[PDB]
Every structure is written in structure tokens, then in C-alpha cells.
């Protein structure tokens, strides 16, 4: 089950719907894909068969 959503995840008593920074965080996170890194951070293109 895929899930495409950019709504803010709240981690506190105060509700967040469009505010982030103090206890509410944007759910996506970007890889820092560089060729300077070693073996444990390289971008592996993974294809699966079901």
C-alpha cells in the first residue's frame, strides 16, 4: 500500500495543521546522495517481483 501525503505529523499536545518547527515535522526527508560516501549510503535501485 503506497501512501502519498505531505500533511504535517504532530508530536505534541498542540495541534498542527499548517505549522511546523517546534514539535511538528514535515514527513518527507531527502537522501544526500553523493559519490563521496562509502558503501553504506550509495543509491541502490531496487526492483521487486511479486
Amino acid at each position, epitope marked *: 500500500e503506497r501512501d502519498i501525503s*505531505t500533511e*504535517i505529523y504532530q508530536a505534541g499536545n498542540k495541534p498542527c495543521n*499548517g*505549522v*511546523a*518547527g*517546534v514539535n511538528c515535522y*514535515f514527513p518527507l526527508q531527502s537522501y544526500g546522495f553523493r559519490p563521496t560516501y562509502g558503501v553504506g549510503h550509495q543509491p541502490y535501485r531496487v526492483v521487486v517481483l511479486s
Partner: antibody
Amino acid sequence: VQLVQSGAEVKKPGASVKVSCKASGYIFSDYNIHWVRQAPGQGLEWMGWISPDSDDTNYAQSFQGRVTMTRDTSITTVYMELSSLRSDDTAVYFCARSVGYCSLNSCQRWMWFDTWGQGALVTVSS
Amino acid sequence: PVLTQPPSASGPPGQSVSISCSGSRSNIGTNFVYWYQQLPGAAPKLLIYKNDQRPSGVPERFFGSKSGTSASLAISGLRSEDEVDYYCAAWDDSLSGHVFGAGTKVTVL
């Protein structure tokens, strides 16, 4: 590194002006460029980006057909033509390089224009 | 869309001054905000990225932060470099691109 660009001069309204930006030193297959103008009496305004390694092109929500953007990978230069120049466009156009790489719409949160280049003032009059 | 900025903010040397930059619900509050300064007759550079950090070659007196849907920048020590203008660069979804502030002029008393 240096990101020198070539300016133009005064010209009649409604024609096409070509501005070019040249890159050197760094590898021109990993970094996006951005095109922002600066007019006297106001601040910066953003137009769009292209990519050196692909045919991606994105436009602002106000300039959909007034500007078309061109890539020259072999010469390591990037070109912009402006179509149907208005009167309130006498500005200084800046070739700006941002670190990283984005093509998607939602990617643009992490980009900042790191290595700017010197701009040139182009004008509209009669 | 665009952001509201004071046209002119000034402060005497020896202490600090603060520059505000408000935003809408989906302009600052979901996206990062960056601070740009430019010399007169020159090209702009980068001062604050990811709302807290600084690049190498920038002194430690330039600090900025945000709490809710607005951000503030504070500079301490105004001798010859803080007379330049500052811009509040961010990103939103309505214009689908980078949006900039009107422009803040900083002077000394």
C-alpha cells in the same frame, strides 16, 4: 567559481532578446541553474529553472509563454529568450546556480542559490 | 505568495537589531526560509540556510530563527557591513516557485 553572463542593450518592445550565461570549473551535469531578475525600485523575482543533463524546464505562474528557456550542453552555456517585452521589465537578470539537483515540484524546499553570477541590465524604451 | 517586510529598520552600533518576515500558512510553516543579502552594485550571497545554519566564511554574529508562521533575523555589530539590504527567500505552493520579500533597508544612527 565564476559564472559570467553576457548582457544586451536597449531595444524596441515586442521583439526577442537573447541572454546567455557561461559556466566553468565545476561539472555542468550535476547542478541546476535558476533565473531571477532584479529591477530598480523592487526586489528579486523568480522565473524558472532548467537542467543541464536533461530536457526539464519549469516556468513561473505568471510567465507561461512570455519566456522559453534553452540548453546548450556541448558549449557549456545556457540561453534565455524573452518574447514580447513589456515596459516594466527593465531589470538586472542573474544567472544563479543552486547546489543539489531537483526536477520534481516538491523537491524545491532544499534548494538555495549558492553561487551567484554578476548580472547585466537590459532595457525597454523607444 | 509574497511576504510582508518593513521598508526600513535601523539601529545604533554597539547592540543588535531585529528584522521580521511574516508568511502565510503554506509559505513559511511548511517550507524552509532562507536569508539573502546583497552589496550595492554586486551579486547576492548566502547567509542563513535551513533556518539556523551558516556557510563557511560567515561570522557567528548573524543569527536567525523561526517559531511559527514567521521568522526573524538578528544582527549584532553594525560598522560597515550591515548597511546592505536583506531579502527573505522562501518557497510555497501557490506560485509553484521561489518567492521573495519586498526588501529591507538597514541603516545606522
